[PDB]
Amino acid sequence: RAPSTSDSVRLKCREMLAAALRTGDDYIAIGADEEELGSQIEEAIYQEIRNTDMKYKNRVRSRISNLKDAKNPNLRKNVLCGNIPPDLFARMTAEEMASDELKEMRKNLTKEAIREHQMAKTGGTQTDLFTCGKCKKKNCTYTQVTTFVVCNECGNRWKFC
For position 15 contacting other proteins by CB under 8 A, the verdict is no
Question: Whole-angstrom Cα distance, residue 35 to residue 26?
Answer: 13
Question: Contacts with other proteins in 74-103 (CB under 8 A)?
Answer: 93-95, 97-99, 102
Residues 6 or more apart from 67 whose CB is under 8 A from it? Answer: 17, 20, 21, 23, 75, 76, 79
Among 6, 8, 122, 144, binds other proteins (CB under 8 A): 144
For position 44 contacting other proteins by CB under 8 A, the verdict is no
For position 129 contacting other proteins by CB under 8 A, the verdict is no
Residue placing its CB nearer to other proteins in the complex, 3 or 123: 123
Determine if residue 81 is labeled as part of a ligand binding site: no
The b-or-e profile of 77-110 (16+ CB within 10 A means b, else e) is bebbeeebebeebbebeeeebbeeeeeeeeeeee
Determine if residue 13 is labeled as part of a ligand binding site: no
Residue placing its CB nearer to other proteins in the complex, 35 or 69: 69
Task: Report the amino acid identity of residue 106.
Answer: R
* Residues flagged as binding site: 132, 135, 151, 154
